[PDB]
């Protein structure tokens, strides 16, 4: 299901579900990053894996992210997608980020690429505290950089879009059920008195 | 095991009157999760959280919580700092905190006050 990567003040409705990329005049540049904590609010929360996981308190297993390119047929480019295990700050440069788990993606006749986020944890499960910086909760980071450049002819659109998707693998597990934080009420709903008439 | 006792408030306006057989609710909430803000909150609807309802006239309430740690054992002592920055407390690992109990009286208030003790 689709990630909401563009969760920014100026993006309205369906615009929040795509990332736009364009040609650059400097090498090695950062495009975007994604926080990975599947219990908290963020790009992962309103997904099939995010919504079901928030009825539980503990989780374990591998995740996959898949990206689809939606430019014209005549557009070309290469990207690098990196996963960094936890311990310090999110990497800001390509030569830092490429030391972690990664895939290099070539645009072509196959439209889409998968990055595996492998289960790498000291404990059997991670744990939903309300603390993002806990050693029992933090997952690390995902980052995307230019490997070459987006290169297009004059009759193509100069700006092209990515849609990002997430799912769990069949090594995944959930436990300790709880009331979901995604719904609530302060009053009776409209027409609720009619059930007593 | 949860044991409850009650007494009439002893300020000089009050005579003794007898003691009410109240209903109580105890709701289990995981470590760090959201808890109710008032006695009549919509959070007490308990849609996936476990709740136990019991009366003062019953035997004490009883239930078992499983071994819940993310590790193979609880740490009784912990020689470290459970965060990636340098700033927080020494010697406490939240993975060893079992959870929360949230406890209310279910009845509305009476015209006179009482003191309730929960063990």
């Amino acid at each position: 299901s689709m990630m909401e990567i563009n969760n920014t003040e100026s993006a309205v409705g369906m615009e929040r579900l795509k990332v736009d990329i364009s040609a650059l005049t400097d090498v090695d540049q950062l495009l975007f990053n994604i926080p990975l904590d599947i219990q908290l609010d963020g790009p992962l929360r309103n997904t099939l894996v995010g919504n079901i996981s928030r009825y539980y308190t503990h989780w374990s297993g591998s995740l996959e992210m898949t990206f689809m390119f939606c430019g014209s047929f005549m557009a070309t480019g290469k990207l690098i997608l990196c996963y960094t295990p936890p311990g310090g700050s999110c990497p800001t440069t390509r030569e830092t980020a490429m030391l972690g788990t990664h895939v290099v993606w070539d645009f072509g006749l196959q439209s889409s690429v998968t990055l595996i986020i492998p289960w790498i944890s000291g404990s059997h499960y991670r744990m939903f505290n309300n603390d993002a910086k806990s050693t029992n909760a933090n997952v690390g980071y995902v980052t995307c950089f230019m490997q070459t450049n987006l290169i297009v002819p004059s009759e193509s659109s100069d700006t092209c879009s990515l849609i990002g998707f997430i799912a769990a693998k069949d090594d995944f597990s959930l436990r300790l059920m709880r009331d979901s934080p995604d719904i609530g009420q302060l009053d009776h709903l409209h027409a609720a008195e009619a059930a007593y008439q | 095991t949860i044991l409850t006792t009650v007494a009439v408030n002893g300020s000089s306006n009050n005579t003794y009157v007898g003691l009410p057989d109240l209903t109580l609710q105890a709701m289990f909430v995981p470590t760090g999760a959201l808890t109710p803000e008032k006695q009549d909150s919509f959070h007490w609807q308990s849609g996936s959280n476990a709740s136990v309802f019991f009366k003062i006239s019953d035997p004490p309430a009883r239930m078992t919580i499983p071994f819940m740690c993310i590790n193979s054992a609880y740490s009784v002592f912990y020689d470290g700092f459970a965060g990636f920055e340098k700033s927080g407390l020494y010697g406490i690992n939240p993975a060893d905190t079992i959870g929360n109990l949230c406890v209310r009286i279910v009845n509305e208030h009476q015209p006179v006050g009482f003191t309730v003790t929960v063990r």
């Binding site: 505290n129 | 470590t31 760090g32 939240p94 929360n100």
Partner: peptide, 9 residues
């Protein structure tokens, strides 16, 4: 509180 978060206020 400190038992849930290991932070002091």
């Amino acid at each position: 509180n400190l038992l849930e978060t290991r932070l002091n206020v």
